[PDB]
CSV table of C-alpha atoms in Angstrom, one decimal:
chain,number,residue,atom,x,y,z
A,1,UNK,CA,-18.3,-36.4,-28.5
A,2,UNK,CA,-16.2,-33.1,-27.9
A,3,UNK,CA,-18.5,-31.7,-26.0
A,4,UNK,CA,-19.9,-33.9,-23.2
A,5,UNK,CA,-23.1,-33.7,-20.2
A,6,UNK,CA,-21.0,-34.4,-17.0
A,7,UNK,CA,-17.1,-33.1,-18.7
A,8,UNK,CA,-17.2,-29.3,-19.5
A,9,UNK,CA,-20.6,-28.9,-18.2
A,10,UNK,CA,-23.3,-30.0,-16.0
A,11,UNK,CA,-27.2,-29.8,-16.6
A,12,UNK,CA,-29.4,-28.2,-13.7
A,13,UNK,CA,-32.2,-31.1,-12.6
A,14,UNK,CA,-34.2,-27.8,-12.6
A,15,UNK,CA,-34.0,-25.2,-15.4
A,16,UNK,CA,-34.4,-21.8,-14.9
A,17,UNK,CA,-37.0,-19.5,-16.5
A,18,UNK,CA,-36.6,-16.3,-18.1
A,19,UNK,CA,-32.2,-16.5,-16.8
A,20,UNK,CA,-30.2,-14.6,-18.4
A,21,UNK,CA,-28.4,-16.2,-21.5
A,22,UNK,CA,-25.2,-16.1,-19.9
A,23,UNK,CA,-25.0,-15.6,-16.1
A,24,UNK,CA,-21.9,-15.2,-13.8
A,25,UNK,CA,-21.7,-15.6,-10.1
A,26,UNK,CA,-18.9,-14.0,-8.2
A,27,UNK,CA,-17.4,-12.3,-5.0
A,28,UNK,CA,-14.8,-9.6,-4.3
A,29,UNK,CA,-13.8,-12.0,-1.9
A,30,UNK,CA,-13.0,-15.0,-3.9
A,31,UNK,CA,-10.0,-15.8,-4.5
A,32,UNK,CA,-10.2,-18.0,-7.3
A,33,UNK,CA,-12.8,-15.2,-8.7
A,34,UNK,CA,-9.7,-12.9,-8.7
A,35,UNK,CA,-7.8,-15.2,-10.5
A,36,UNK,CA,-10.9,-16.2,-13.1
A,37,UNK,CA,-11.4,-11.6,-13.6
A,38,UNK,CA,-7.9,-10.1,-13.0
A,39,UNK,CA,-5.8,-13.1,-14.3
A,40,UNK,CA,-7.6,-15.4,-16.8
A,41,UNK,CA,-9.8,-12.8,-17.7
A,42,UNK,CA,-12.8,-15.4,-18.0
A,43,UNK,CA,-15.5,-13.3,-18.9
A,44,UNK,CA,-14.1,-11.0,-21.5
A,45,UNK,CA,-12.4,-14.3,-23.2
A,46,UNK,CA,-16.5,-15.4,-23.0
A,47,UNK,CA,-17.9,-12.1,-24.8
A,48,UNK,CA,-15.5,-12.2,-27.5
A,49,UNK,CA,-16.9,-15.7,-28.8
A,50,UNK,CA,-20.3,-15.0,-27.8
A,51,UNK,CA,-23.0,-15.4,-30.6
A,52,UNK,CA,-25.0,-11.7,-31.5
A,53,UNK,CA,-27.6,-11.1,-29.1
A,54,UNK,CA,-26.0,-13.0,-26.4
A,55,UNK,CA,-25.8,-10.5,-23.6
A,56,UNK,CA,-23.2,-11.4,-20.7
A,57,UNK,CA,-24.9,-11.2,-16.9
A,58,UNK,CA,-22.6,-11.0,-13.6
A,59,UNK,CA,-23.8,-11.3,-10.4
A,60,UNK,CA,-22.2,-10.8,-7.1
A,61,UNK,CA,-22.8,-13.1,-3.9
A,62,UNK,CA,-23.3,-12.5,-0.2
A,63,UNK,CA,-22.1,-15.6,1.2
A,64,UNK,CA,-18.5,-14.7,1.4
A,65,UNK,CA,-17.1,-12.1,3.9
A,66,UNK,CA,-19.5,-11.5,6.7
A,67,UNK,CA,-21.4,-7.6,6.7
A,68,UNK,CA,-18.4,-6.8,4.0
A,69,UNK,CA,-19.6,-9.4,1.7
A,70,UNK,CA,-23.0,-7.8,1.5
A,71,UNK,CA,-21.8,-4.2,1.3
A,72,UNK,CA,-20.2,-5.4,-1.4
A,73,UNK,CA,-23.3,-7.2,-3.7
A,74,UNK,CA,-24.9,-3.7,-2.6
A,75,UNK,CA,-22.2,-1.8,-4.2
A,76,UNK,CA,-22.1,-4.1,-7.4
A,77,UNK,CA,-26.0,-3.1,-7.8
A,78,UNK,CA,-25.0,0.3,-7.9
A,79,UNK,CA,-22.0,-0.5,-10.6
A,80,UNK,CA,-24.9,-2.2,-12.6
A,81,UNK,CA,-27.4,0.8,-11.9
A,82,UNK,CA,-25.1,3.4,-13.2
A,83,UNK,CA,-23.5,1.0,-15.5
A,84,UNK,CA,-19.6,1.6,-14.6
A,85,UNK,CA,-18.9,-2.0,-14.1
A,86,UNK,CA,-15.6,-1.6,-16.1
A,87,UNK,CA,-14.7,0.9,-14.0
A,88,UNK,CA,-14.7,-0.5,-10.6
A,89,UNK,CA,-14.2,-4.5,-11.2
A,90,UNK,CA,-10.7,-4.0,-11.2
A,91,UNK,CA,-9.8,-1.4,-8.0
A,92,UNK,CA,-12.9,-3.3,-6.3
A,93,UNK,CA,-11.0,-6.8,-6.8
A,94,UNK,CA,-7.2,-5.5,-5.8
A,95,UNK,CA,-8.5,-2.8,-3.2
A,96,UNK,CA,-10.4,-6.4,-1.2
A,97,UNK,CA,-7.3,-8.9,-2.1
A,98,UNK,CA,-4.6,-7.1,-3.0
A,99,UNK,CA,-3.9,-4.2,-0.9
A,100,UNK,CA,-6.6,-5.1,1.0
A,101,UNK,CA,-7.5,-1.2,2.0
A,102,UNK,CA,-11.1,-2.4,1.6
A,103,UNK,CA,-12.2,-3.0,5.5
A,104,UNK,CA,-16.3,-1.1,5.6
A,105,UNK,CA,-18.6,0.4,3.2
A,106,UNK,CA,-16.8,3.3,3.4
A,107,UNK,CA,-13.9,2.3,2.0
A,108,UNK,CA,-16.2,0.5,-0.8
A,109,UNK,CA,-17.8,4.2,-1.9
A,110,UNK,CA,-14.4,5.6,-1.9
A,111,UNK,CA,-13.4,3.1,-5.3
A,112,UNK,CA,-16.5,5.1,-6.7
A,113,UNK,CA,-15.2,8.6,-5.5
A,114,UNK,CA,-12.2,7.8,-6.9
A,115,UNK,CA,-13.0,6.1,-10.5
A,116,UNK,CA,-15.3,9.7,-10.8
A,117,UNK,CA,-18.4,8.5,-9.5
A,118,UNK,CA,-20.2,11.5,-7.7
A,119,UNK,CA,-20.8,11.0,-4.0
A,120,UNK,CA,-24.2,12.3,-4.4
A,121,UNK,CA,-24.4,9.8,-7.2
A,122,UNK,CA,-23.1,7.0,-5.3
A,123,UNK,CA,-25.6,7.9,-2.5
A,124,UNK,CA,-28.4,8.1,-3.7
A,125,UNK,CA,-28.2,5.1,-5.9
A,126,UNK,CA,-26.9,3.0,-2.9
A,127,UNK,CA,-30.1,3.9,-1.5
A,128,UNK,CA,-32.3,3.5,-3.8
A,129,UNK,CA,-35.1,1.1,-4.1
A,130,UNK,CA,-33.7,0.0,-7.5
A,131,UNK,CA,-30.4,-0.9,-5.6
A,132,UNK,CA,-32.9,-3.2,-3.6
A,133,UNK,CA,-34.3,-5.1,-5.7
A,134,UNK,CA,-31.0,-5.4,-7.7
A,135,UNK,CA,-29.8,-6.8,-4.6
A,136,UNK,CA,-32.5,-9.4,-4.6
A,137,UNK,CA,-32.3,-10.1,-8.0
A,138,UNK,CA,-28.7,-11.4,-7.7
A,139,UNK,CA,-29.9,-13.0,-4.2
A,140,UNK,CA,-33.0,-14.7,-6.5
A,141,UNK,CA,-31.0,-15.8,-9.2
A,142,UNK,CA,-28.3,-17.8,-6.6
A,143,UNK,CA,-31.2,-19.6,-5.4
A,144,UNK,CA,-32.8,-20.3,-8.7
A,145,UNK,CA,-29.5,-22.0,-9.8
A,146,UNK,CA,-28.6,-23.5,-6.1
A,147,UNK,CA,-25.5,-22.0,-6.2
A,148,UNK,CA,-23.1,-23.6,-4.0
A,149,UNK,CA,-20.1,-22.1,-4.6
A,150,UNK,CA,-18.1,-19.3,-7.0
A,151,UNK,CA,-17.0,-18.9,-9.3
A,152,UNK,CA,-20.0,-20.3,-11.3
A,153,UNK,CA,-21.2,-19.8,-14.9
A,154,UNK,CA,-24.8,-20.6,-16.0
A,155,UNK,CA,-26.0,-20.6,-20.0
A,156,UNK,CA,-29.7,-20.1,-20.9
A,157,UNK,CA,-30.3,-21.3,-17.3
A,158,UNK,CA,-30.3,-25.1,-18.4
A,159,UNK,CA,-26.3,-25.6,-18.2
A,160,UNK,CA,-23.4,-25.2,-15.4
A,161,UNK,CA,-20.0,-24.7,-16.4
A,162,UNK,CA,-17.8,-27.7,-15.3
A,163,UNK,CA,-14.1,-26.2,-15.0
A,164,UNK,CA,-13.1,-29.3,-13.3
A,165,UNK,CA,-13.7,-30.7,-16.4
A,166,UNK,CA,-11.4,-29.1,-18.8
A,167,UNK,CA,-7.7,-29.2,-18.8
A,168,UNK,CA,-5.6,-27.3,-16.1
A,169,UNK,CA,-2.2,-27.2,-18.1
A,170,UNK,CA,-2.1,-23.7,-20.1
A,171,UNK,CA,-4.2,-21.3,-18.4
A,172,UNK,CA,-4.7,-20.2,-22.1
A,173,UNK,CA,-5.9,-23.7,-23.2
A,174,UNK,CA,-7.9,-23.7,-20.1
A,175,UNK,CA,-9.6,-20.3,-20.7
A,176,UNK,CA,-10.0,-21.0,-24.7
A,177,UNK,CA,-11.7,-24.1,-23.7
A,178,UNK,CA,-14.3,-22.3,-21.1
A,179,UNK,CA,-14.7,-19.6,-23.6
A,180,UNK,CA,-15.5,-22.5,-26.7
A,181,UNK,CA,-17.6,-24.4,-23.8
A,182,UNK,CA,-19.9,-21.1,-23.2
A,183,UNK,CA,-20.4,-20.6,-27.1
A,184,UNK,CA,-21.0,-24.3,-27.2
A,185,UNK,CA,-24.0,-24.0,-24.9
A,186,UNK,CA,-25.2,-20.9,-25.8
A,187,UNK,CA,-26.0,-22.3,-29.1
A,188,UNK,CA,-27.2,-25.7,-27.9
């Protein structure tokens, strides 16, 4: 068929209950990440073929980057907890790869300052209990899937996206196909 088990996806031996419909795993240190947010723009291609009432999930991961790395899944639980995702993905992603003037969790809280985040704000939500168990949430989740590596896409926690799988030519072709491969599964 078009759409194959084992071509643009994989199936998890072990499905996940209650996952979100579609989940992404990611680091500020991943290369290929930067490529797949700031130059494919993977998961805004995703949302706009998603069915309605298909929310999009993205989670960060500590495995990448040493102390840094985990400063950083901290700091992307309080993006989600004060919801300005959109606002820091972007100087978050250059400020670690690009100009690479993110070195401690300092310089992490100054993206916030910056992108008009409150330092208060930042503060006390960084320290909150509900950061915590954000943190563990995305920490849960990369168990529940056995993540091995990112960039990683998951649909109704029964399905792994298979990149490797699709064509490489176009980037365009490449992303249109993830995108169709996501709507695929969601509705599979």
């Amino acid at each position: 068929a078009q759409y194959e088990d084992g071509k643009q996806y994989t199936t998890l031996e072990k499905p996940v209950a209650g996952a979100p419909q579609v989940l992404e795993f990611f680091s500020f240190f991943c290369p290929h990440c930067y490529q797949f947010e700031e130059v494919l723009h993977i998961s805004d291609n995703v949302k706009k073929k998603l069915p309605e009432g298909v929310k999009m999930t993205k989670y960060h991961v500590n495995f990448m980057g040493g102390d840094l790395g985990k400063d950083l899944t901290q700091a992307w639980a309080v993006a989600m907890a004060l919801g300005v995702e959109d606002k820091v993905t972007v100087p978050l992603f250059e400020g670690v790869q690009k100009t690479q003037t993110i070195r401690s969790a300092s310089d992490i809280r100054d993206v916030f300052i910056n992108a008009g985040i409150k330092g208060e704000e930042y503060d006390a939500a960084w320290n909150s209990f509900v950061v915590k168990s954000l943190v563990a949430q995305q920490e849960k989740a990369a168990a529940d899937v056995q993540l091995r590596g990112v960039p990683a896409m998951f649909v109704n926690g029964k399905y792994q996206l298979n990149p490797q799988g699709m064509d490489t030519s176009n980037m365009d072709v490449f992303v249109q196909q993830y995108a169709d491969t996501v709507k695929y599964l969601s509705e599979k």
